[PDB]
Structure 1
Amino acid sequence: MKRAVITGLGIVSSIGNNQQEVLASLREGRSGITFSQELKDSGMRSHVWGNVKLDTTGLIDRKVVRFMSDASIYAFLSMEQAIADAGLSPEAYQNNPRVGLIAGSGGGSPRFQVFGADAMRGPRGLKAVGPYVVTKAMASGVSACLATPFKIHGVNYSISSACATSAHCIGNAVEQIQLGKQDIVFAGGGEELCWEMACEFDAMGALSTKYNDTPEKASRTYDAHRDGFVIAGGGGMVVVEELEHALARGAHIYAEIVGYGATSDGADMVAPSGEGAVRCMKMAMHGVDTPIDYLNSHGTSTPVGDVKELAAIREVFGDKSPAISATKAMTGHSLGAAGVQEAIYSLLMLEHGFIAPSINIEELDEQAAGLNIVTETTDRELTTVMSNSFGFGGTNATLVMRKL
């Protein structure tokens, strides 16, 4: 069947506003985590976040931006970058039934939902709400707000699956290529960063609270004293393209997507089962005839989650486990954006031949022993990389990407 490759990428993240900045951060092991007065003022216990350090004012046409929440803004900027990176002209990708968009968010916009409800409850009612809240607050905001301005004619929808959202978007893009239905699908996602949503995670005890005085040290996947994830926002987009189409136009090809796993735990709402993750990784590796050289773990800095994933990795790989690092120790957890951003970090590692460090491991967890968790930037000629995304609701995605 038809083969899918990645021919362009774009990213707005806590560790950089484009792939050059991101690459520099990854090589330097630089944290994107800062203290948040907003989170503290809200009454949360977690006062740290992976914020986007970019003034987005004026970067998007008013007729376009008026419909957007922050998740859409970040995804739109990421898409602009990916189109430039891929070398695609509007003549080629616009008004083209074979060009689609699959991009989502984990939460939509709790900020604008709450804005709408607060405004409605005041003296001015509907007039205070205004006419733009639906496209800001609806679950499909990221796809809707981008398909119009980019003149997309093919598929147009959002997948959501919490922490796995943008990984399933990429996988679904691969399926569209495999089915012969699309030549190009822009795939990715975005997530806003706001107390309105973050407080929901703090309320379930999911966020780091013990390291607020040292924000760069809060996200610490695999460290014995990890205490929850650090919430983040941002966006990413990749250009998923059918192989012959890419070759015909002289595309720059980063990698082929040679595996896509998607499974379900059918067990616990918020904790991973392990069994689902093993099936997901094995599914992504089926027929892949090369070893995994580097695995970018889901690894959110949670007591239970981090080691559940490691146990699954041991079962999958037996006595030949890959180099591993958890880039969330640098970036935080961008929820709906995490899958595509982490696919991008993995692609940059593949393209530039290095492994980004798993930072903040002062004492390695006993359940991580004997694995090559890479803690210093390492130059290495990679060929095949794997990235895991294991979301709330027992939803699992794994992507395997390989040089062509």
Structure 2
Amino acid sequence: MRRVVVTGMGIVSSIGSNTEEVTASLREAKSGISRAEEYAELGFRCQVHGAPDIDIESLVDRRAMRFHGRGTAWNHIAMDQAIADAGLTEEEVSNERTGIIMGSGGPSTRTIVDSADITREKGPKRVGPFAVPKAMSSTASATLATFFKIKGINYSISSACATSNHCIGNAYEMIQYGKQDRMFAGGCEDLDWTLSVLFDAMGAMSSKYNDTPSTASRAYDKNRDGFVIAGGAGVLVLEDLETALARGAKIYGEIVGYGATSDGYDMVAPSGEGAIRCMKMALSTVTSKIDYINPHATSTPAGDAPEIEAIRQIFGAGDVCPPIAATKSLTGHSLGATGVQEAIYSLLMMQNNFICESAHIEELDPAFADMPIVRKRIDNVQLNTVLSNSFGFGGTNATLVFQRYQG
């Protein structure tokens, strides 16, 4: 099997509109969470969100936008960034050896709702002729594959919170097995009340911190009370190692493990044992120690703990366990985009030799007092190998391990 490296990254996040902004946010523990006035207007319990702040119209032209939902527009931007970062020629983007696996946890629910509304108010024709590609689950791959003239693999993987971890992992497999030499992998999610309300109604999102929105997402805090939803996108450019080397690519890291498992247990809550198997699977092909864990931890009572127990089972507790820092405390949970975004945060931490604070831990949950949850940014750390989990609704688990490329 071939080796596979990350040669470019692009990101639209609640904590920044490019990798530089994101890095600064990570370094300074700058929360991307703000009040969602619309959620309050609609009567939600949760009135916070992680909203990107980026001018789509300035970055994606009108014809390009014809078939985009906002999530995929953000993914388009991320794709442009990743292509630029990678320094790819048009030929390198568009060829039979280059594919795309790009997913979202949902499609444009706003398109779906707006279309239903307008059908009933003004008639079906007034939906307009461009809604299908926005509304379909493959929207992220369909739109980008078409616009970027992708000729290889083209589909979306969806797996809720794990979506873009699976997208990356499957793309990794594609290249490992020699089916593609380059892949664009990642995912996106719109941020819209029509999606967020589904989570609010299940009581899944934080509401106790509406008056201090910036600190609402607080993985491992004793008083965490649900996740904070976000939107955005991320893209990695993946290449087989020879391809990367031959063109003098940047190498942000090497993908060295990928785990994917299923809990087969509960729709909304993790089992824990699935995560253990997922991490073990990811680690089964990894020879070096893990220097940092980017957990799934979404700031939920029921979610943060079983993952920590899974980590304890694999890695132990205290100093021997890799440092753990939950980036969702800063970023919220962007569902389809989370996996790739977390890969990017981890690769940026690797690049910049620091591990961010696991933010907003005002009082650590005592259940986690034995674990190396990062309470203050760690500087001057040589990260060589980083592990990132995403454990999604439906008991779907994906773990990725990235390594600093040193030959």
**So what's the TM-score if we normalise by structure 1?**
0.98
CA shift, 1:337, in A, is 0.3
3-state SS of paired residue (2:346): helix
Aligned partner of 2:45 in structure 1 is 45
Alignment of 1:147-162 (within 5 A): 147-162=145-160
Aligned partner of 1:278 in structure 2 is 276
Kept in 1, the 8 Å contact 2:92–2:98? The answer is no
Alignment of 1:148-227 (within 5 A): 148-227=146-225
Structure 2 distance, partners of 1:112, 1:101, is 23
Kept in 2, the 8 Å contact 1:3–1:256? The answer is yes
- The count of aligned residue pairs is 402
Aligned partner of 2:262 in structure 1 is 264
Structure 2 distance, partners of 1:365, 1:226, is 9
- Seen in structure 2, the aligned counterparts of structure 1 residues 104 and 287 have a Cα distance that, compared at 3 Å, is closer
3-state SS of paired residue (2:239): strand
Aligned partner of 2:360 in structure 1 is 360
Aligned partner of 1:67 in structure 2 is 67
Aligned partner of 2:289 in structure 1 is 291
Could you give the per-residue CA deviations for residues 369-394 of structure 1, whole angstroms, max 9, x where no partner exists? Answer: 11111121111111100000000000
Aligned partner of 1:81 in structure 2 is 81
Structure 2 distance, partners of 1:288, 1:327, is 23
CA shift, 1:40, in A, is 1.0
Aligned partner of 1:305 in structure 2 is 303
3-state SS of paired residue (2:260): strand
Aligned partner of 1:398 in structure 2 is 399
1:2 aligns to 2:12 (yes or no): no
Kept in 2, the 8 Å contact 1:79–1:236? The answer is yes
Structure 1 distance, partners of 2:205, 2:269, is 14
Kept in 2, the 8 Å contact 1:99–1:184? The answer is yes
3-state SS of paired residue (2:147): coil
Aligned partner of 1:25 in structure 2 is 25
2:346 counterpart letter in structure 1: S
Kept in 1, the 8 Å contact 2:222–2:365? The answer is yes
Structure 2 distance, partners of 1:387, 1:144, is 27
Could you give the per-residue CA deviations for residues 328-362 of structure 1, whole angstroms, max 9, x where no partner exists? Answer: 00000000000000000000011111101101111
Structure 2 distance, partners of 1:287, 1:264, is 19
RMSD, aligned α-carbons: 0.8
2:53 counterpart letter in structure 1: K
Aligned partner of 2:134 in structure 1 is 136
2:327 counterpart letter in structure 1: T
Structure 2 distance, partners of 1:185, 1:287, is 21
Structure 1 distance, partners of 2:316, 2:210, is 38
1:181 counterpart letter in structure 2: K
1:389 counterpart letter in structure 2: S
Structure 2 distance, partners of 1:373, 1:332, is 18
Q: What is the identity percentage for the equivalent residue pairs of Structure 1 and Structure 2?
A: 61
3-state SS of paired residue (2:217): coil
CA shift, 1:287, in A, is 3.1
3-state SS of paired residue (1:325): coil
1:91 aligns to 2:99 (yes or no): no
Structure 2 distance, partners of 1:58, 1:85, is 19
Structure 2 distance, partners of 1:132, 1:33, is 32
Aligned partner of 2:230 in structure 1 is 232
CA shift, 1:178, in A, is 1.3
3-state SS of paired residue (2:112): helix
3-state SS of paired residue (2:324): strand
1:112 aligns to 2:111 (yes or no): yes
2:181 counterpart letter in structure 1: D
Structure 1 distance, partners of 2:200, 2:329, is 18
Structure 1 distance, partners of 2:182, 2:382, is 28
Alignment of 1:351-390 (within 5 A): 351-379=351-379, 380-390=381-391
Could you give the per-residue CA deviations for residues 33-56 of structure 1, whole angstroms, max 9, x where no partner exists? Answer: 011111111111111000011121
CA shift, 1:149, in A, is 1.3
CA shift, 1:61, in A, is 2.3
CA shift, 1:91, in A, is 2.6
Ranges of 4+ aligned residues in structure 1 off by more than 3 Å:
none
Kept in 1, the 8 Å contact 2:263–2:396? The answer is yes
CA shift, 1:63, in A, is 1.9
Uncovered stretches (5+) of structure 2, i.e. residues with no partner: none
1:145 counterpart letter in structure 2: T
Could you give the per-residue CA deviations for residues 70-104 of structure 1, whole angstroms, max 9, x where no partner exists? Answer: 1110110000000010010103222x100000001
Aligned partner of 2:100 in structure 1 is 101
Structure 2 distance, partners of 1:334, 1:382, is 25
3-state SS of paired residue (1:220): coil
Kept in 2, the 8 Å contact 1:310–1:367? The answer is no
Structure 2 distance, partners of 1:56, 1:39, is 22
